[PDB]
Backbone as a ProteinNet text record, in pm:
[ID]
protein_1_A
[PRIMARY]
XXXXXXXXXXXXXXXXXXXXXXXXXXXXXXXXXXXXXXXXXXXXXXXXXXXXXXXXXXXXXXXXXXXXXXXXXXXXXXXXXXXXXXXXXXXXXXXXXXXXXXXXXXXXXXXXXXXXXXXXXXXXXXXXX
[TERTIARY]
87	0	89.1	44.8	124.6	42.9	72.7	7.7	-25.4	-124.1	-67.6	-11.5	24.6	88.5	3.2	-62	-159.5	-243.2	-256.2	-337.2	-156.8	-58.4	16.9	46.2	44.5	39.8	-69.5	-177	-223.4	-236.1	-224.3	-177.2	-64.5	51.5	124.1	100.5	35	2.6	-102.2	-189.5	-258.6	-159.8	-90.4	-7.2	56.5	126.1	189	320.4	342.9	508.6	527.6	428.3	411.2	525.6	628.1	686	749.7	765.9	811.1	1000.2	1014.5	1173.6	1167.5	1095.9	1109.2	1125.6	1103.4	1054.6	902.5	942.9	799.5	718.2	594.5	557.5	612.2	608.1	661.3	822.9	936.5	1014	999.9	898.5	849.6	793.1	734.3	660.1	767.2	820.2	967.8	1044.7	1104.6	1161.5	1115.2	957.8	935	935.3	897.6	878.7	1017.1	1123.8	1255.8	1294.3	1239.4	1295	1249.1	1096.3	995.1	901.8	918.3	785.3	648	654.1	535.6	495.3	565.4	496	558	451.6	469.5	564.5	529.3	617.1	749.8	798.4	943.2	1060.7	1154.2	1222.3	1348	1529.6	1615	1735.8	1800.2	1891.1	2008.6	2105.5	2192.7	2356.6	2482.9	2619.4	2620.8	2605	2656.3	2557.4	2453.3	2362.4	2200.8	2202.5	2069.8	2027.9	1873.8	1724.1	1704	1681.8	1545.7	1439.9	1310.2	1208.8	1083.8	990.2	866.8	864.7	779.5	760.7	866.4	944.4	1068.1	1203.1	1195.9	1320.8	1408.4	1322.9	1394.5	1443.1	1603.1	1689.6	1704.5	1709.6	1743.4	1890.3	1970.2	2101.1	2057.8	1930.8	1982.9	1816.8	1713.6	1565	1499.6	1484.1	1353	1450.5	1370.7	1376.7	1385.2	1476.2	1396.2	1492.3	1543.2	1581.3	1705.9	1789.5	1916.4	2009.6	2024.2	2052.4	2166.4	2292.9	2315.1	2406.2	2397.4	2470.4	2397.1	2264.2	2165.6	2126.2	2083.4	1977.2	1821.5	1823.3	1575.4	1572.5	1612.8	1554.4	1424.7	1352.6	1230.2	1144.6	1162.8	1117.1	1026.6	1030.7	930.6	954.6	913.5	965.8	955.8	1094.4	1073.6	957.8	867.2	714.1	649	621.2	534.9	543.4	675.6	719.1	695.5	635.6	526	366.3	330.2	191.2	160.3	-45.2	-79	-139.1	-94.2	-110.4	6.5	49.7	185.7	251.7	139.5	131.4	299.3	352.7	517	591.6	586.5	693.1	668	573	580.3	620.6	611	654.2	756.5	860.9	1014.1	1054	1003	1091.6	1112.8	1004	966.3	1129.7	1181.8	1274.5	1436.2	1416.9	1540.9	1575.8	1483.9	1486.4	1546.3	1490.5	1528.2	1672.3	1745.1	1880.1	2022	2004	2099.3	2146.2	2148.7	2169	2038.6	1916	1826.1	1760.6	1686.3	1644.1	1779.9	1876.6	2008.7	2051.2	1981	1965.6	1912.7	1811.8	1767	1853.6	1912.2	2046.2	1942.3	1860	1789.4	1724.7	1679.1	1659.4	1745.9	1891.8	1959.6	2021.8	2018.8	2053.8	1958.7	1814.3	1759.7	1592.6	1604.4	1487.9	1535.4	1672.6	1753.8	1761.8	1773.8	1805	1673.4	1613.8	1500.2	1394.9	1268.7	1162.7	1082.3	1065.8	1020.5	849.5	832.2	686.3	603.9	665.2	590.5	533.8	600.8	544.7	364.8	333.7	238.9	172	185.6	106.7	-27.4	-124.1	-262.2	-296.2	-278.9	-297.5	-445.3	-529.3	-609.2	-644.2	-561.7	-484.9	-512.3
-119.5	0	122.4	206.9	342.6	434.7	477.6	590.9	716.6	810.9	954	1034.9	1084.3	1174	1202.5	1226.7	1238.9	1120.8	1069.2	907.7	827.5	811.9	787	860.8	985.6	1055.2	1017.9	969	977.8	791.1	742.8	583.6	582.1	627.7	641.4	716.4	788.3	853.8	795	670.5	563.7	496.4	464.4	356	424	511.4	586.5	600.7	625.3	648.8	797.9	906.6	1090.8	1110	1170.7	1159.3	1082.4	942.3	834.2	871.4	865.5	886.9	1013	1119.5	1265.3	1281.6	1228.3	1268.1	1261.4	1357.5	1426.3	1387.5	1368.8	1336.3	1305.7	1475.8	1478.6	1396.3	1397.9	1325	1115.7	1157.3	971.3	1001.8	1070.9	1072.4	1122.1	1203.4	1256.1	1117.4	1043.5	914.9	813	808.9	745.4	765.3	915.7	972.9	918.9	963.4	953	762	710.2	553.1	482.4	547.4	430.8	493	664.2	660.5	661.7	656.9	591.3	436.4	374.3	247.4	140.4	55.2	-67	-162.6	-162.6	-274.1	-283.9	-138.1	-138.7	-227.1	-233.6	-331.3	-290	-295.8	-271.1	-362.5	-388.8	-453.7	-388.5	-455.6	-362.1	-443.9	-381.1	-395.3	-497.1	-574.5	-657.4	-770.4	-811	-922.1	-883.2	-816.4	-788.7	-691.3	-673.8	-611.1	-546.1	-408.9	-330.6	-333.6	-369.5	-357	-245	-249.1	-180	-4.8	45	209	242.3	181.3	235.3	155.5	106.7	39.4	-24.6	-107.4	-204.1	-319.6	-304.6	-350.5	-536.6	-658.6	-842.3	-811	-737.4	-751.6	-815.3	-672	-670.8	-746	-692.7	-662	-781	-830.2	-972.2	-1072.5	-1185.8	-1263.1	-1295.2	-1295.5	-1296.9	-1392.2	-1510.6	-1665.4	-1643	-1521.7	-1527.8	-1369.2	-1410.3	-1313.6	-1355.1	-1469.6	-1548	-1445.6	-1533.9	-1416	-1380.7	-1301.8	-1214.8	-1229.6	-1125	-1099.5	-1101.4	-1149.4	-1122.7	-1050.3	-909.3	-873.2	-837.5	-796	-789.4	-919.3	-1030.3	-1111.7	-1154.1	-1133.7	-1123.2	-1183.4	-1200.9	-1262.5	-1087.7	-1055.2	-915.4	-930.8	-1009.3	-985.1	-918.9	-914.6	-867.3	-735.3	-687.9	-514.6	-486	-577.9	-485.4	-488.4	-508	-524.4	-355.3	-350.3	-269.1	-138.9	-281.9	-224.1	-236.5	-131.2	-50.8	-103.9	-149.4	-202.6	-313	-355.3	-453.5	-332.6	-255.6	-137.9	-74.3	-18.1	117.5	-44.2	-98.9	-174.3	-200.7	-269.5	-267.7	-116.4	-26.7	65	154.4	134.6	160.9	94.6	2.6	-75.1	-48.8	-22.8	15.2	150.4	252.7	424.9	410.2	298	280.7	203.2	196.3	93.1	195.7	314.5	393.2	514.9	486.2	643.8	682.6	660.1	703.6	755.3	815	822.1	800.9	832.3	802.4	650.2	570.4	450.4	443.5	520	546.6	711.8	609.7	734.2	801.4	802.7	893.6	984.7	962	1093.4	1109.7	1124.9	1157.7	1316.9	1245.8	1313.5	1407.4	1342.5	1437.3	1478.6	1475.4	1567.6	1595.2	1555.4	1609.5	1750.3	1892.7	1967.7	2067.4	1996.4	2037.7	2082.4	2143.2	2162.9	2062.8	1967.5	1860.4	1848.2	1969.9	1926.7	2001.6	2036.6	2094.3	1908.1	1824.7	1700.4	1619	1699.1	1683.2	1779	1925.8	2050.5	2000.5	2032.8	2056.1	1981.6	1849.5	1761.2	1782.8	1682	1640	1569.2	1586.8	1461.4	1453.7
0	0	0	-99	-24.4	-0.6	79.3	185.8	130.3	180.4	154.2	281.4	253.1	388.3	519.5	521.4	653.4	707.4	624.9	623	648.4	630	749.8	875	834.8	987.1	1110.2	1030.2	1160.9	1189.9	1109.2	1160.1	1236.3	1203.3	1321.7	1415.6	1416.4	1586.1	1645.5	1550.6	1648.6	1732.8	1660.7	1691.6	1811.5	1822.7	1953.2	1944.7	1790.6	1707.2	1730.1	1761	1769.9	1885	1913.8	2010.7	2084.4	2059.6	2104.8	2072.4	2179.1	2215.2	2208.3	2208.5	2191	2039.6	1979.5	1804.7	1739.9	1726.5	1675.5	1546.6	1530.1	1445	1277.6	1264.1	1158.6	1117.8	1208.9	1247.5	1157.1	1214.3	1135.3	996	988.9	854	751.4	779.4	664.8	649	739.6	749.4	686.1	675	537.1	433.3	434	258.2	177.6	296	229.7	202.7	271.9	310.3	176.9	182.8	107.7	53.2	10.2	-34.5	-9.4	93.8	184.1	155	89.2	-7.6	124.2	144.1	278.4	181.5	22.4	-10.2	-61.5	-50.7	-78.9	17.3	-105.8	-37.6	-126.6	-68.2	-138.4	-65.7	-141.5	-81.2	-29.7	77.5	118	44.6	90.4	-1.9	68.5	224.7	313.4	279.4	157.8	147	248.8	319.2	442.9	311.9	359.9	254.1	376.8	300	428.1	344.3	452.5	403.5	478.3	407.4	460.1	444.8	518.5	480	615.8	648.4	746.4	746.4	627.9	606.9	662.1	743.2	872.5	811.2	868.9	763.9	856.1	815	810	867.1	839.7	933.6	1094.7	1159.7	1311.8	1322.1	1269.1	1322.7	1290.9	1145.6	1111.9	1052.2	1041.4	943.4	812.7	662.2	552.4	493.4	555.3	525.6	447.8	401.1	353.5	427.2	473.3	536.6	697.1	594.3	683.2	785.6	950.3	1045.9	1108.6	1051.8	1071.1	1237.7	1277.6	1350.4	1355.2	1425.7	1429.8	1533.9	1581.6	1730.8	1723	1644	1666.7	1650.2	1611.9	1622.5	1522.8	1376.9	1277.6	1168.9	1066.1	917.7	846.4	787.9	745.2	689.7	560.9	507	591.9	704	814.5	812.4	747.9	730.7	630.9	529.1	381.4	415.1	505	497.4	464.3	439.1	425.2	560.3	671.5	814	883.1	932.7	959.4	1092.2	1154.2	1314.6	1344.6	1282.9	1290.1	1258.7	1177.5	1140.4	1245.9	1337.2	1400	1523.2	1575.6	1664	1683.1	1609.2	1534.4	1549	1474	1506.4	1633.7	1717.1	1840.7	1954.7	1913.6	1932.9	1881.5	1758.9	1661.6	1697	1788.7	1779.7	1919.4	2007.2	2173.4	2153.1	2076.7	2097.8	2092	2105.8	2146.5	2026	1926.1	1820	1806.7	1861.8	1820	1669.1	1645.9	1446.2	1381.1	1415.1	1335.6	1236	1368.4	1272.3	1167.8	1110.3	946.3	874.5	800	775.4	663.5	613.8	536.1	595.4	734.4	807.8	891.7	871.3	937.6	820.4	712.8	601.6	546.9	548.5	489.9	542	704	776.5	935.6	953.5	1051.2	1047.8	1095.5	1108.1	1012.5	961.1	882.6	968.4	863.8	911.4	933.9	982.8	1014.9	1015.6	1046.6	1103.6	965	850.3	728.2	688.9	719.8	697.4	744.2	884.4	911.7	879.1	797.5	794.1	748.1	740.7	720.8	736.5	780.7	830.6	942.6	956.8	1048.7	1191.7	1286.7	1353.2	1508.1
[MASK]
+++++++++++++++++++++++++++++++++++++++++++++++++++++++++++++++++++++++++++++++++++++++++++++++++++++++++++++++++++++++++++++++++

């Protein structure tokens, strides 16, 4: 599924992603635009053999499952598929986890690069929420 901008904004602020670690809405929603598009089914591979998947690009190195990905980690406990669905609920969970493991948003180097130091919250503007 891909999203539109406010129709993920406010799925993640069901979910209870708005502020979580002290990042702000918009904070998450820029982090996808940049990751994925908003699209749940993107998927890219990385130089080390690990895929990030989903609308937050939770990368088979440390976080899920996706059966080649030898070495790998599962800390979240999932088969990465679970991070394309059209319901967001494993991504905002996982990353709820990946944001708490010490660099905080840094771990998604696309918003580190490109809604770090930004206006962040033009992402949720007119929004309904």
């Amino acid at each position: 599924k891909v999203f539109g901008r406010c129709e993920l904004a406010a799925a993640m602020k069901r979910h209870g992603l708005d502020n979580y670690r002290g990042y702000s809405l918009g904070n998450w929603v820029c982090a996808a635009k940049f990751e994925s598009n908003f699209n749940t089914q993107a998927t890219n591979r990385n130089t080390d053999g690990s895929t990030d998947y989903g609308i937050l690009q939770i990368n088979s190195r440390w976080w899920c499952n996706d059966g080649r990905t030898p070495g790998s980690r599962n800390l979240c406990n999932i088969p990465c598929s679970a991070l394309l669905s059209s319901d967001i609920t494993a991504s905002v969970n996982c990353a709820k986890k990946i944001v708490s493991d010490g660099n905080g948003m840094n771990a998604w180097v696309a918003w580190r690069n490109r809604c770090k130091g930004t206006d962040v919250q033009a992402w949720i503007r007119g929004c309904r929420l």
